[PDB]
Design a protein around this ligand. Structure first.
Ligand SMILES: Cn1cncc1NC(=O)Cc1cccc(Cl)c1
Ligand SMILES: Cn1cncc1NC(=O)Cc1cccc(Cl)c1
Lengths: 304, 304
């Protein structure tokens, strides 16, 4: 028992990290097979970042301008291309440590692990959620660009995020591995609206189920609610409206605990209306929304 | 910017995980050089666990009774010995993935990463602290025994913990890599007192410094305090008494922010006496004590 904000083991991803330098800019790249993926802003200087013309900036670069180093091994760049906000550097050597992998575009509310890197070297790993507004609340400093987010299913790494930038609000934005930003963001140093965020209701309910499984049950009550009634409360408290699709994905947790999804909704409704009254749930004094129902099941069953 | 409960990259440790089976019991082992380390209770059945005579139970076992499998590679056991609560199985092959490593016994209040494993396979990684009462609040299910805790300094892995058991209270206990339990615990299925825990004051202050660095400053006030006065409040709120050694280790954070350690103590005193008034600090609604001053500096400077 016990419930922790657990990240996937990072080994398969550490084997793919490289350093990419172009001119005076250094950031991280991801080496999979004979391609290195990195944020296209590696080609910019600081003067360029207010409104870069990426196409023109890239035209001034040749394969030999992209210095790619895998630890201490220098990679030979034989091609380069820009795909949306990423650069793809073709190298002459396939990464011997390439795991089985997929590129996926995750949905808002889904979770993933981030391997934060600097200069091609891993510094740490943490789990987070893609906010409903497509930002992530990460831990990233200058030089972390090119660090990736991923999930692992057995031996397959699904890469879902590449870090690009920190918004003036201190939240983070990036792309899928095809270089498409999550959210409305652009890779320019301009103030950019993130838009209204909400709490991921289905994840809070999953985490309440994790709490009951792991012994914290003080919040259970004698009440029930309906989706309509619960959604009026979700509205008032800036929570995502709960749908039958969310109730369905909570089915396994509801079956395991014997607590009907709408009964757990009534516990959540009371917590929203009354607060925690100075108590905690799974070591937290707020309602946690960074665990999906799949994460709760995986953690509670011991999936490797 | 941003501040997350970050674990060390787990790759170097994933390369050391093996499955150890003895009789009907399977758990995890750590393969370093030509030795596999695992909890000695791999030799017990469930009838044995109420009060095992480990010396007698081990005498009935031969090298060929310890089945060690590294993924799909079977290891040949050429020796076995019990050292405190661990078994050391000498194998005929040195682990080719053995990183540079040390065995260390950490102090209460220090932090480390745990690579939770089942059947020799890594499931996830999380950061935690050794409580002042020598327990850890982890996420461990049956079969996680033998999972290890560690820190990494550049290319060196300092192993500090091997998981052994869950106490009836749902908290976790284990040993250093020489098999000595942290705390008063014994490897028997008996109810065991963990003893009074306290909050790690120096870590809460470090985390308040991390909050100021990362933009959360609402808790800063116009007050100061003394070690004597602060320790009267620490006493009332079950916090560890702050010493000059703790003030000294907070020196780098105090220098970086310009906030004197006793002034941060007065902010902590007011938070203890008044609560958070429904606000948060670094996404938390309680005072976090699982980040040491070294962790805050490492995370805030981007150490790889
Ligand atoms: C400070 N930091 C944290 N995580 C990433 C960074 N770096 C940046 O934000 C640099 C940057 C500035 C404008 C646009 C873009 Cl795409 C990138
Ligand atoms: C449930 N669990 C979680 N983490 C470890 C376990 N397994 C155990 O606690 C099994 C066990 C029982 C008594 C003594 C000992 Cl040393 C071990």
């Amino acid at each position: 028992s016990g419930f922790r904000k657990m990240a996937f083991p990072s080994g398969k991803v550490e084997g793919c990290m490289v350093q990419v330098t172009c001119g005076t800019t250094t950031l991280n790249g991801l080496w999979l097979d004979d391609v290195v993926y990195c944020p296209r802003h590696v080609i910019c200087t600081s003067e360029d970042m207010l409104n870069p013309n990426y196409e023109d900036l890239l035209i001034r670069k040749s394969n030999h301008n992209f210095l790619v180093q895998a630890g201490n091994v220098q990679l030979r760049v034989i091609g380069h291309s820009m795909q949306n906000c990423v650069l793809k550097l073709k190298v002459d050597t396939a990464n011997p440590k390439t795991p089985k992998y997929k590129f996926v575009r995750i949905q808002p509310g889904q979770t993933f692990s981030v391997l934060a890197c600097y200069n091609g070297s891993p510094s740490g790993v943490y789990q987070c959620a893609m906010r409903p507004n497509f930002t992530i609340k990460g831990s990233f400093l200058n030089g972390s660009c090119g660090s990736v987010g991923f999930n692992i299913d057995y031996d397959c790494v699904s890469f879902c995020y590449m870090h690009h930038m920190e918004l003036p609000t201190g939240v983070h934005a990036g792309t899928d591995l095809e270089g498409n930003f999550y959210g409305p963001f652009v890779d320019r140093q301009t103030a950019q609206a993130a838009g209204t965020d909400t709490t991921i209701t289905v994840n809070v309910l999953a985490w309440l189920y994790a709490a009951v499984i792991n012994g914290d049950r003080w919040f259970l009550n004698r009440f029930t609610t309906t989706l309509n009634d619960f959604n009026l409360v979700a509205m008032k408290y800036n929570y995502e409206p709960l749908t039958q699709d969310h109730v369905d994905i909570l089915g396994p947790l509801s079956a395991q605990t014997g607590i009907a999804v709408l009964d757990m909704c009534a516990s959540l409704k009371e917590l929203l209306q009354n607060g925690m009254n100075g108590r905690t749930i799974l070591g937290s004094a707020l309602l946690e929304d960074e665990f999906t129902p799949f994460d709760v099941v995986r953690q509670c069953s011991g999936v490797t």
